[PDB]
Design a protein around this ligand. Sequence first.
Ligand SMILES: [Zn+2]
Ligand SMILES: [Zn+2]
Ligand SMILES: [Zn+2]
Lengths: 105, 115, 100, 463, 46, 567, 58, 193
Amino acid sequence: DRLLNSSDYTQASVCRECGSILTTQQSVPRIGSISTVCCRRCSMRFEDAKKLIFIDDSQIWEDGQGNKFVGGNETTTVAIPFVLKYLDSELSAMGIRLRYNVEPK
Amino acid sequence: MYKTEKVDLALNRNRGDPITQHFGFGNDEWPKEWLEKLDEDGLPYIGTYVEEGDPICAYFDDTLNKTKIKTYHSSEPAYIEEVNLIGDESNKFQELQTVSIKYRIRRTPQIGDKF
Amino acid sequence: PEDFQQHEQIRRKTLKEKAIPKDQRATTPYMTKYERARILGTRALQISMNAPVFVDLEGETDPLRIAMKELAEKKIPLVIRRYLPDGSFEDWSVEELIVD
Amino acid sequence: SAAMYSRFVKSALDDLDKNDSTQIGIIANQVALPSKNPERINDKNLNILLDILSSNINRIESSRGTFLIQSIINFEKWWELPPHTLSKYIYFIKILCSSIPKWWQDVSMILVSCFILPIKQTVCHHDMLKYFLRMIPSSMGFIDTYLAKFFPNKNDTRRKLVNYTSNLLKLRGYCSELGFQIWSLLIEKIISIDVELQNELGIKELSTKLDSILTLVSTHVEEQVTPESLESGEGVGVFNTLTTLFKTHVLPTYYTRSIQYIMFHVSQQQLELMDSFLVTLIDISFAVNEAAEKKIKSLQYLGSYIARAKKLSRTQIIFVASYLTSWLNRYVIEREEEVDQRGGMERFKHFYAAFQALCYIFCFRHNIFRDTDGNWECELDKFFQRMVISKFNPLKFCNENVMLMFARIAQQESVAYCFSIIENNNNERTRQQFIDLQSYFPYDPLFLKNYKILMKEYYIEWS
Amino acid sequence: TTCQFLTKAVLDNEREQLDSPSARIVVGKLNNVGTGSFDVLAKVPN
Amino acid sequence: MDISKPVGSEITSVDFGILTAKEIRNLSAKQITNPTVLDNLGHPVSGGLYDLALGAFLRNLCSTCGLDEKFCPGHQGHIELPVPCYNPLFFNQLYIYLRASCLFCHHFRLKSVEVHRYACKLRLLQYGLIDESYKLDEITLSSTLLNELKSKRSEYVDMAIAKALSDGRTTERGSFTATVNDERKKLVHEFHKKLLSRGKCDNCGMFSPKFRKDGFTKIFETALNEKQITNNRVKGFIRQDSTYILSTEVKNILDTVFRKEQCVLQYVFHSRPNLSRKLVKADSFFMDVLVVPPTRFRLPSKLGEEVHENSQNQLLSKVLTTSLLIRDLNDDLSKLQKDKVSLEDRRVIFSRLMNAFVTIQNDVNAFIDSTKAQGRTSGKVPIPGVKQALEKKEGLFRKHMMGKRVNYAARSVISPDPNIETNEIGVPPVFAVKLTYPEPVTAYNIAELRQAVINGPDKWPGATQIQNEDGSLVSLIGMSVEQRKALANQLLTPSSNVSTHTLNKKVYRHIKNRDVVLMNRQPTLHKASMMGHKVRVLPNEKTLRLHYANTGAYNADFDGDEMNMHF
Amino acid sequence: TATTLNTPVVIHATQLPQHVSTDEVLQFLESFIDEKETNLSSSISQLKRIQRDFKGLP
Amino acid sequence: ARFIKKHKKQVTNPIDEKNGTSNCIVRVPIALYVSLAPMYLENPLQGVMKQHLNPLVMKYNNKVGGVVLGYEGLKILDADPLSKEDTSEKLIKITPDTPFGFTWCHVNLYVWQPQVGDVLEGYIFIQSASHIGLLIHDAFNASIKKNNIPVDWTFVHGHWVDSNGEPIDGKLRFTVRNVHTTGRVVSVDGTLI
Ligand SMILES: [Zn+2]
Ligand SMILES: [Zn+2]
Ligand SMILES: [Zn+2]
């Protein structure tokens, strides 16, 4: 209640694939389409992916700048204390990576 | 209990600078409920009851072309006791920039008071 | 896709190789003070969201009190899964545990 | 001009295959302008732009083409265009949603929102909805949510509300299936009006609002459910759906009259409408499960209904009530001793509730319960007395105004006595919610102008 | 010293199994000892 | 935390590791290159530290996700370091391996056979096989014998792990208890001691020049001693078939040693079996890029009315200037023909380059470890680096994770009361009216909650708001009695939406005698200084009232001591 | 939109998809339509139209 | 040495006889981990159906790689691994934080999984100079763009005309160029060359 619930407790996105909570973002969709949750680490720049079979439409997403990506759709939400995000952020400044193993896979 | 607060709108100005803010009201459109607490000079009428959020001061800001308002901050309501105009030396010419407002707070003895 | 199936089958197989049999249970036949509290709270939670209730309310408006009543008559459809420290477990029905 | 513009666009499209995208955008921006700005692309040039785009829509199905398309879907007051030009706009939209059925979502939303407009200004919108619902049945999903999204709020302008229902009715008439979301919207909105009217009991506003809405609904129902339509039609289906929805929303929620009448009134159009709906209420009444409050609310509904209706058989009603009363003999038998047993008379709220309703029904339809002989249907003379002297002592636990009126009337009819039982009662003399629940009668008289007149054929005023 | 031990964990490529009270508070996981000593399952008919 | 927003996914373990410069570049939302943070109109400078790709900032929207300052989680970017730097966190370990290396044959100077004996032992310990690791030492039956020894030790380790897996002693995930961890740590210590204890290389017989350090992460290489240069050329025929030394030289040396000595390193750097099969790379001790944390985590502060820059930005901009300056040194470098340039200008250009590298490396060091930075402009007092942020006072962990600020809880002076129950607490209405407990609305409580909503925020027992099925809240604050009566009549309406059909509304009702709170007096030295009391709301009271029977537990004196009430 | 209340946390095929004859598609449509007789109603209505087309009709 | 190539269509597909089209209807068994709301504790199968399965009907689903037509043989996997697959009393583990259950289920999905290259037949419902609009199985949208129609085909005011001067009508046979799936409803891009 008191060190989580009646305090912070705010769902966050993880990539089930790389186990990060820092490399997810909302996609920016074309008008009419719905936004989805994607991992910047696990996805290819669109060009580079073409340069190596056909690529399905649901597998492409875009950011605000406009770059297109392929993949990185293995995300969910987990309940974590917010301060965890801060710690993970500081650690990555120091070159350190936390990798959360999430279930179900 | 008595508390004295000093309102000094020369706090920002960089030393003998042009004066941006003057006590009083501007001619733009401002609340009007303000005159319940404040006299024409932008200072509060003596005796006024004042609770958290009320105006205790009104000045016109030049850089904003608006009339602004220092508000009362204690969660305990009070009455205005003395309002002192602290003029400046260095020979007159200077207009009002510093004021002291003394609040009076009632203390009826309560549960939890020590004797 | 073919191999997630395999992964699941392995998970489910091992999970069935740990759970101890009922006729092979070895922990206390008494409900623990912890088990009781959680059983009450959780059943109360389900009552607050329109779980079918197995007893007469008789004017009660506190879902915790309703749970307590259900507990008293042994009509709480919950099961406690007790974990031994190696992760294997014993399932005990709320009705079968001696309550005090 | 005429042919110069044909070039301008034809160039623009070439320029688009090259990705320059400037020429198009210049055009798009020109069509996107407001209905007011004189500088918005004129009809003749628009005729051209449109017919050229329609002729090879695939030239545009690109990221570069998006903005142009968006600008034409968002063309202000297109329904206000000209015939010939209107036709080219329609053909374009038709063509567009065919290949990339992705814009139909955007087009229909705007269409539905135009339902606030008169019975005429929407024809084109419905024509289009009917068309594409048929060819793209999968769309019904998101377009249903549109029905939700764009409903006007109760606060919003009356013309908005009255329009958005006028359109929904029009929609109903070419997309029979979608039905549910619509009916959910109307119901959800009417409950808002009824609830608010009660609580409040500006107000002059809600009156004429809620008045304009109900009078509409009921006249459409007077038409739409019809004997012809009941044997071979969707009037019967509509009736069933409506009844279920109505009961459920009405079945539940607490203390307000202004919508439940819709059922009071449609009911009494035809004998069977009365029958089946009434049997549904009977099914409600005596289910074992139902909230001590649901069974009591239904019983109030039941009693109020029988009393007030007009398109009744005397006899389909009375016999069922008599059976319920025999239902009564069982209740007391399987419970007084449950009476002399541990507990209070509150254990039997539900009994009194139903007995009230039946007594109340007898007050208003008394003069009816005497058959040709001058004998009483259901042996009411012998029956009432038995309950009155029972151990439940109904007279003590039921209402304070019905029990009185029943006394008066029953005594007058030599049916049952009671002034001494009352004397004895006030000599011997969560509880509030119950008194509250027993005071509300969902079919006590209505307020308001037209509906009243319409109900007259179906209503018995106290007079 | 946080950074020293962190340093040790990284160089071991350690996995935090999340069993200690401290670790679970860090990640927001329900505590083990006490309540976290049994599972609840629902008996479902049909 | 909301009981109607359940979470399906669950974190079950955390793995520690190192970000590679490849990962970072790929995930990055923007490469940051401008030291300057704002322009004359207070907008983020593009490519600067507040660049909008790193997240919404003030009234601007995030350029990466499009969300505003409230819903935008922030995104990381990166700085490109023009020259490799030692990661200050792992500088001591780098030092150990560097010193242990043979700069000639590129193995560790410790004899291969011994190193293999450690690899065998550590590998066994990954599976918790402590007895076996001692038995490994029991193995004996010049370079021909040794490879058979190595080989038979190797076949023992395999046979032991195989046997251990077949019975119930291990999994492929290993076995890791305290006794195992103790044996492991000893061995690694013993191994490192033996690494640094060798002079001449046991494997090729050469001498490598000795390496020396700073406390500021600089590495010096001491050239060879006389006897040692003599010894080295004697071995010259067999091989035929002080100064600052740049971080790039060091990395090349370790890169090769890590390839050759990969086997042992595979177990020195993994306490569990390395299922992932990733190589152990020297790069892990270095870094070419820096991760710029999201913007939301790099905002200015206001000290009353005056606004102060963010200290982490002050440090990052120093990295930025040095960076531009080195990119210029690098431009003049090859921008001047050698023919015209001089062994005379060659020396000076190098002098300037060394200077730049050293001071940027110092500014980086000072961050993740200010205690490694050169004290600035003698005065000012240092600006905290990341280490100091995590370790300020009791430190982030203790001050904001093991303990936190709470909410809803109240505090008051306590007063005695003999007229409440020994298990109650007398709650002043001033609290009772502000506390919230959610109520879900049901058939069994619709009467009660109707009344609460009608009563409103200010008449007890009332309510302050309603949660709708779509999660939205409606305030009862500004409302008239009629508006409230209306909302009270729609508390239990059916669902007009399939997605929320499983939910019911919630009424945020005022305190109630039915309720339980948690009372606390500090210091809390045993559990009875934090107990549950039944609530009893008392009109006209301004303090918490507590029966005497509880003083013992709380160690309470009624001398103006205060308690906390948690709801 | 999608929550844990209306959307599976994860879905996995356990086998390779097996192709089905027309006679099977028809037997399945038959029973699935019958068993499911507001959103679901208007949907089986549409499925009913598709099974009609499979059989060649209007 | 690296396998992102585990997004490769592992559901091949052929054509037909006595016919010429492809058969894209397929039956795939799945496992799915789903929530069970407390209101359904007495009707768990009903609840899994109304919460999770029903919303999948006639929508594209990324995992089966097609449109889900429907489902058969739903089964809950008892959290009690000791019970017989028979019994109608089963265990569903309850979330620590919430009253919701989560169980695994097995069910069978019927999926329309068309893929580029396939040969389909459509019922013509619209003809502009820009595209031909068809309806496959009287349910799913198709569209042949103006320049996927062979060059000698002509148009009039309207309606198309073929290589030999005779108008086309009703059933038309085309090959799949691309399948657009992200819009409100699925739409097929078809070609005639
Ligand atoms: Zn990832
Ligand atoms: Zn963002
Ligand atoms: Zn060597």
